[PDB]
TrEMBL record, chain A:
The gene is rpl28.S. It comes from Xenopus laevis. The keyword Ribonucleoprotein applies. InterPro entries: Ribosomal_eL28 (IPR002672), Ribosomal_eL28/Mak16 (IPR029004). This is Large ribosomal subunit protein eL28. It comes from the Eukaryota. GO terms for biological process: translation. Transmembrane segments: none annotated. The keyword Ribonucleoprotein applies.
From TrEMBL, chain B:
Residues 1-41 form the Large ribosomal subunit protein uL6 N-terminal domain. It comes from the Eukaryota. One of its GO terms (cellular component) is cytosolic large ribosomal subunit. This is 60S ribosomal protein L6. The lineage of its organism: Eukaryota, Metazoa, Chordata, Craniata, Vertebrata. PANTHER family: 60S RIBOSOMAL PROTEIN L6 (PTHR10715), LARGE RIBOSOMAL SUBUNIT PROTEIN EL6 (PTHR10715:SF0). Component of the large ribosomal subunit. May bind IPO9 with low affinity. The gene is rpl6.S.
UniProtKB/TrEMBL annotation, chain D:
This is Large ribosomal subunit protein uL30. Residues 69-119 form the Large ribosomal subunit protein uL30-like ferredoxin-like fold domain. InterPro entries: Ribo_uL30_ferredoxin-like_sf, Ribosomal_uL30, Ribosomal_uL30_CS, Ribosomal_uL30_euk, Ribosomal_uL30_euk_arc, Ribosomal_uL30_ferredoxin-like, Ribosomal_uL30_N_euk. Signal peptide: none annotated. One of its GO terms (molecular function) is RNA binding. It comes from the Eukaryota. The lineage of its organism: Eukaryota, Metazoa, Chordata, Craniata, Vertebrata.
From TrEMBL, chain F:
Keywords: Ribonucleoprotein, Ribosomal protein. The gene is rpl32.S. Belongs to the eukaryotic ribosomal protein eL32 family. SMART domains: Ribosomal_L32e (SM01393). GO terms for cellular component: cytosolic large ribosomal subunit. InterPro entries: Ribosomal_eL32, Ribosomal_eL32_CS, Ribosomal_eL32_sf. One of its GO terms (biological process) is translation. Pfam families: Ribosomal_L32e (PF01655). PROSITE patterns: RIBOSOMAL_L32E. GO terms for molecular function: structural constituent of ribosome. PANTHER family: 60S RIBOSOMAL PROTEIN L32 AND DNA-DIRECTED RNA POLYMERASE II, SUBUNIT N (PTHR23413), RIBOSOMAL PROTEIN L32 (PTHR23413:SF1). This is 60S ribosomal protein L32. It comes from the Eukaryota.
RNA sequence: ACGAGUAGGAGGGCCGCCGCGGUGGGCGCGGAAGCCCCGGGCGAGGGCCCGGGUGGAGCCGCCGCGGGUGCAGAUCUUGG
RNA sequence: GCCGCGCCGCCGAGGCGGGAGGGCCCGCGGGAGCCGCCAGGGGUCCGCGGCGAUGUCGGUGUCCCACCCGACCCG
RNA sequence: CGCCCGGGGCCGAGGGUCCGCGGCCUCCUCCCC
């Protein structure tokens, strides 16, 4: 029921930031920080979240488990990837493409992981 | 070898011979009808490496690809034009630069359209240098320089600025005396031309370019 | 001198309207429309002096400034021409000198 | 492997079925154009022969009255009589400096008579028809002014009437055919420019030195200056 | 539902410049295939009449 | 920091649309008010009067709201509102709010420098 | 393809004002509101953001909700 | 005025069949083929020059002033 | 556009084939080197 949940969070959300004619979302699992249907990080059963590591180096690829839907404590699986820039992108690419896990967010997660590594 | 185009250009975009005339001229009845990686050896066995590995960084945004056009050839492949009044041997009149209003002798058009211009240096202190035809007034006075041999190395890269004080090299002086030694004997055959090239051009009172014949 | 004498006779106008983005020049020797063809496309220049110094190409800075233009077409039958400049000519230049260069040459 | 090569040639035969289909339609409109190229000349040489026939015998050969007329609206939209304003809409001349071809009959000439001060019509020749349809020619697909760039637009909406190319459209407008109504209504009203060189007097009739009315063969001069 | 749909028209068509066929040669011969033949016969006849 | 693309921004009008008779009176502010007088010259758009702002003066949608540097302004108030500009930093620049203290402006500037986000007011208070 | 507009009608406003339920782990004595600005800007406009100065304690964005919600005129009212 | 025939005139309005040759032509015989070219589904250069921290560069629309044109006070 | 050539001014909006040719798919000859 993503489309059902979208029509509610479409214009009414604590993460929506509307100013300067732009709408940005502050949800954690959003790759473009864009308040759209595709990139919304809480609406779909499959979400991809590329967060910076707890320390100053590395990224964290956050996937949404299939059975972890209504149990948020055991819903997301974090993947810490602290390698070189070329290998880190190859890991994120294989997590998305090889698993058929949100292939629409494949390059969106590679560009976000590239910005975090800077 | 590849034969030349058997269809002469009757007009721009129009061939002289039809599809059937070219078929007979060509006699077409006689006719009938990778490795993206490389392997290397090391001291744990053999390693297969891939050429052009994946990028190590992706920008936050990217510009879309432009559409496909045609006829937008680069400058090196452009067609070169030349006014019919500018023939090898015509005495030009420079309009711009420090040598503005001075008279020069046209030698040859360079591949980039610029005109190889000489003073000569021994007359009006103008060496062999390029000159645009748009900023040049061609007069009706022509000297016969058909016997003058211009060296082949006088190309656009020869006159391209080397990009801290400029100094004329010994090659420029040798190429100057090589061409001047051939122009001076034929300039002397035309009387009062030695001082005409020394002189400068300027508009006085009553002289109007729209009615002045050059 | 390598330029022809011209006078800024005024802007392209009617009687109750004025289009300042087009100027009417009067060349000193052109008194007929059949003589304006030679000047079609020639560089125009409104050279003047100001207070503050400005950079000079190929030289040292001075008070001389210039507004470049180009003869676009003829105007009337008395040798007048039209010229468009990168900046519209100031109204103080009406009746002053405009240098009509000999380039781009077509001779 | 066998299914791949089989599904591959099915795509190639789909492209071969199109390139051959284009060469057939292009060969048809090539023969139609060369037939029009010869027909346009014969029609003129026929009348010259018949005129020389009458003058040889001392008689007179009266040519057929023109069937085609190109009507240009010269006056604006300010202060128009209701009856005149209705006829100018039936001729699709809803603004100044636009032209539409008219099939001349008694029901049409009387319409051109009710709007003479507002129109300047005449009898266009072949060059006038061809230049208007080539340069100023536009198409009305779905009440949308579509430019005439390819013959696919004409054959799609005039193919059931034997019109496949632009030459078929010109041959239908110049020589009034059975499908002149659909062919002319398929052409958008020619938005012409102001007459280069000026008019004589827009408020009077062409006979009295003006520009309104019916200039029989002088409408071509007006087209050259407006097209 | 996919069995009932048509082919997705993923082709975007834009406005064309509409080059003048009377001045542009390739545009004229795209609308009139015989235009190149008539142009050729007209030039060759002019050279023959000279 | 350069934007993704810096096209030539075309503005149909640079001057401000002043209100009719805003100079003759101090009570009449320069803010545009459409004249609705029955005999008003500006309302009837006579020749030589003040112009009326209407649609048609609207700037190109591709270059609308773009700052002269090429970026687009975006107001931020803390680190979280700054990190949403991490992506698309080649098309939007950060602008620290006016009501934030100089103590927190130093943190927003040093964080935006890491994220390659341009700040329109980098050195404001210091 | 089209674009005038009084009286008038309708729609849109990420125009503005006051207050409320929400919401931003918002903002603030490391200086809020207000005010000034030959400061930088943005929007076609209503307006808005930023900088400086002044000021000394509150204030604002977004989703909805309630109006005593926008002034140049009324020989308007009060004050100067 | 029609209809039939004949004669004659008709750039070649012309169409058919054949004959002596001469020579100008064909989207006839050339395309699921490779290479390029381009008057071909809207511009590019795989062209280039001058200028450089104490007096210059750009902006300064909205600070002043000058000139041409337009322009009468709102409700 | 009836055939060809030339000149001046104005501008390039958009941005993931169609239509004409030529060479080779056929062997040589001449010019130019
Ligand atoms: Mg009237
Ligand atoms: Mg009247
Ligand atoms: Mg503005
Ligand atoms: Mg009134
Ligand atoms: Mg209240
Ligand atoms: Mg009230
Ligand atoms: Mg008041």
């Amino acid at each position: 029921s993503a489309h059902l949940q979208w029509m509610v969070i479409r214009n009414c959300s604590s993460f929506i930031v509307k100013r300067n004619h732009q709408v940005f979302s502050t949800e954690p699992n959003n790759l473009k920080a864009r308040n759209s249907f595709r990139y919304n990080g809480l609406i779909h059963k499959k979400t991809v979240g590329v967060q910076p590591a707890a320390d100053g180096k590395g990224v964290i690829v956050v996937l949404k488990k299939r059975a972890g839907q209504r149990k948020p404590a055991t819903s997301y699986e974090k993947i810490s990837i602290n390698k070189n820039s070329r290998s880190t992108l190859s890991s994120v690419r294989h997590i998305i493409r090889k698993n058929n896990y949100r292939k629409d967010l494949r390059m969106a997660a590679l560009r976000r992981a590239s910005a975090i590594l800077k | 070898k590849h034969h030349c185009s058997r269809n002469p250009v009757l007009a721009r975009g129009i061939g002289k011979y039809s599809r059937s005339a070219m078929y007979a001229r060509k006699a077409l009845y006689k006719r009938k009808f990778p490795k993206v990686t490389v392997t290397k050896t090391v001291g744990g066995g053999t390693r297969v490496v891939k050429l052009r590995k994946m990028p190590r960084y992706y920008p936050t945004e990217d510009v879309p690809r432009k559409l496909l056009s045609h006829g937008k050839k680069p400058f090196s492949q452009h067609k070169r034009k030349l006014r019919s009044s500018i023939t090898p041997g015509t005495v030009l009149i420079l309009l711009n630069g420090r040598h503005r209003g001075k008279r020069v002798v046209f030698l040859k058009q360079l591949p980039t359209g610029l005109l190889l211009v000489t003073g000569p240096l021994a007359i009006n202190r103008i060496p062999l240098r390029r000159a645009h035809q748009k900023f040049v007034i061609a007069t009706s006075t022509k000297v016969d320089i058909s016997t003058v041999k211009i060296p082949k190395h006088l190309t656009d890269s020869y006159f391209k600025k080397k990009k801290e004080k400029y100094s004329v090299t010994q090659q420029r002086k040798a190429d100057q005396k090589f061409v001047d030694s051939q122009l001076l004997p034929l300039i002397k055959k035309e009387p009062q031309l030695r001082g005409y090239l020394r002189s400068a051009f300027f508009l006085s009172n009553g002289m109007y370019p729209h009615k002045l014949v050059f | 001198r390598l330029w022809c004498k011209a006078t800024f006779a005024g802007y392209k106008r009617g009687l109750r309207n004025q289009r300042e983005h087009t100027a009417l020049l009067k060349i000193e020797g052109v008194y007929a429309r059949d003589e304006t063809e030679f000047y079609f496309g020639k560089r125009c220049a409104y050279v003047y002096k100001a207070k503050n110094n400005t950079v000079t190409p190929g030289g040292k800075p001075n008070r001389t400034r210039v507004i470049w233009g180009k003869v676009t077409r003829a105007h009337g039958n008395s040798g007048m021409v039209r010229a468009k400049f990168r900046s519209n000519l100031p109204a103080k230049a009406i009746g002053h000198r405009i240098r009509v260069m000999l380039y781009p040459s077509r001779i | 492997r066998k299914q791949f090569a089989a599904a591959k040639l099915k795509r190639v035969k789909k492209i071969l079925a199109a390139k051959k289909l284009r060469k057939t339609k292009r060969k048809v409109i090539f023969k139609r154009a060369e037939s029009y190229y010869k027909e346009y000349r014969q029609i003129y040489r026929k009348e010259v022969r018949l005129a020389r026939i009458a003058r040889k015998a001392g008689n007179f050969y009266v040519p057929a009255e023109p069937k085609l007329a190109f009507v240009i609206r010269i006056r604006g939209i300010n202060g128009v009589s209701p009856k005149v304003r209705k006829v100018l809409q039936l001729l699709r001349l809803r603004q100044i400096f636009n032209g539409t071809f008219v099939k001349l009959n008694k029901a049409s000439i009387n319409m051109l008579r009710l709007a003479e001060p507002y129109i300047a019509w005449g009898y266009p020749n072949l060059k006038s028809v061809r230049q208007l349809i080539y340069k100023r020619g536009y198409l009305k697909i779905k009440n949308q002014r579509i430019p005439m760039t390819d013959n696919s637009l004409i054959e799609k909406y005039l193919g059931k009437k034997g019109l496949m190319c632009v030459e078929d459209l010109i041959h239908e407008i110049y020589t009034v055919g059975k499908n002149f109504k659909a062919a002319n209504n398929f052409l958008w009203p020619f938005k012409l420019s102001s007459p280069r060189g000026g008019m004589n007097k827009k408020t009077t009739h062409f006979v009295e030195g003006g520009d309104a009315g019916n200039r029989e063969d002088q409408i071509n001069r007006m087209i050259r200056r407006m097209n | 539902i996919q069995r009932a749909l048509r082919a997705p028209n993923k082709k975007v068509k834009r406005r064309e410049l509409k080059k003048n066929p009377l001045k542009n040669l390739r545009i004229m011969m795209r609308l009139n295939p015989y235009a190149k033949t008539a142009r050729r016969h007209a030039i060759l006849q002019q050279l023959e009449n000279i | 920091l350069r934007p993704l693309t810096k096209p030539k921004i075309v503005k149909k009008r640079t001057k401000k649309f002043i209100r009719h008779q805003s100079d003759r009176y101090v009570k009449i502010s320069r803010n545009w008010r459409k004249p609705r007088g029955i005999d008003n010259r500006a309302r009837r758009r006579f020749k030589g009067q003040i112009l009326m702002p209407n649609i048609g003066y609207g700037s190109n949608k591709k270059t609308k709201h773009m700052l002269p540097t090429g970026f687009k302004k975006f107001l931020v108030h803390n680190i979280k509102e700054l990190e949403v500009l991490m992506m698309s930093n080649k098309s939007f620049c950060a602008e620290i709010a006016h009501n934030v203290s100089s103590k927190n402006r130093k943190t927003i500037v040093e964080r935006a420098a890491q994220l390659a986000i341009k700040v329109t007011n980098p050195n404001a208070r210091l």
